[PDB]
């Protein structure tokens, strides 16, 4: 009990210290970064209204960890969802597992009734290839259309920001300098909502799959985390934020994603009911053990969508490094801090 109680007390203190000195983003930086996101969003709305009122798009809106207060270390990225207007009876969703490619968590969007509803029935028909709405082509078209009407230098002067598009292949990303030597990256994310299926143009790592839309998970995942914590004032999000801060701070663990780390916590929250403040140290080591377990198994099921392996996009190369890094730190987790 002595040695173990000891290790746990030390770790708890170091975990709590690590959160405040590394994971937590300064209020000033956080306020100004979000204000910059909101400024750009408002300005784009006015732009879309004046210049592209006939484009079948709903208004762009902000989404992401920075909006959910789950971002860590620095306020450096947020998404602007670009939601396409697609008529129900002209389009449908095909699950990736119901496809030859066989890719869970991704979808084909098929143009329906190509005869009865001829080409031109939707603006987005121009982005249809082989009968399917291409995420890539949609993204290229949106970039073209906006860039051919937008005036970032002018908007920058207005808001007193340095605003510039990043060079490809991150061309739907906006580099926003909202204060001296601090930048916010706003990436424009085309989205489709058909029925209750919400999809986003976040390409599969493999270009051979660039015609597939990704099933959007973050919102439902974020909501279940918050509800789990709100009911018992648990430290699920604190633990998550610490894990994110570590991976974002450690080059060798950079391959892990916020979504992957979130589902590790959601799986543990399924196993462990008690997330009272004093259990943080124990839940942290448990999260690290689970990480290793999933990595060795090569699969991490999505807690909300179990057919989906969230590690499916990691190469053997990266799996190896993650396991390696975590196997080098087993004896002394505090090293990760």
Curated annotation (Swiss-Prot):
Q: Does the keyword ATP-binding apply?
A: no
Q: Where in the cell is it found?
A: Mitochondrion outer membrane
Q: What is the effect of changing residue 244 to E?
A: Abolishes nucleotide-binding, but not DNM1L recruitment
Carries keyword Repressor?
no
The UniProt entry lists membrane topology as: Single-pass membrane protein
Segments on the Cytoplasmic face = 1-337
Q: Which UniProt keywords apply?
A: Membrane, Mitochondrion, Mitochondrion outer membrane, Nucleotide-binding, Phosphoprotein, Transmembrane, Transmembrane helix
Q: Name one GO cellular component term.
A: mitochondrial outer membrane
Q: Where does ADP bind?
A: 63, 65, 77, 216, 218, 244
Tissue specificity is:
Expression is relatively high in heart, skeletal muscle, pancreas and kidney.
A GO molecular function held by the record: GDP binding
> From its record, what is one biological process in GO terms?
mitochondrial fission
Q: Which disease is it linked to?
A: Optic atrophy 14: A disease characterized by visual impairment in association with optic atrophy. Atrophy of the optic disk indicates a deficiency in the number of nerve fibers which arise in the retina and converge to form the optic disk, optic nerve, optic chiasm and optic tracts. OPA14 is an autosomal dominant form characterized by adult-onset progressive reduction in visual acuity, and pale and excavated optic disk. Optical coherence tomography discloses a severe loss of the retinal nerve fiber layer.
- Recorded family membership: Belongs to the SMCR7 family.
Q: How does it assemble?
A: Homodimer. Interacts with DNM1L.
Q: What does this protein do?
A: Mitochondrial outer membrane protein which regulates mitochondrial fission/fusion dynamics. Promotes the recruitment and association of the fission mediator dynamin-related protein 1 (DNM1L) to the mitochondrial surface independently of the mitochondrial fission FIS1 and MFF proteins. Regulates DNM1L GTPase activity and DNM1L oligomerization. Binds ADP and can also bind GDP, although with lower affinity. Does not bind CDP, UDP, ATP, AMP or GTP. Inhibits DNM1L GTPase activity in the absence of bound ADP.
Q: What is this protein called?
A: Mitochondrial dynamics protein MIEF1
Q: What is the lineage of its organism?
A: Eukaryota, Metazoa, Chordata, Craniata, Vertebrata
Q: Which gene encodes it?
A: MIEF1
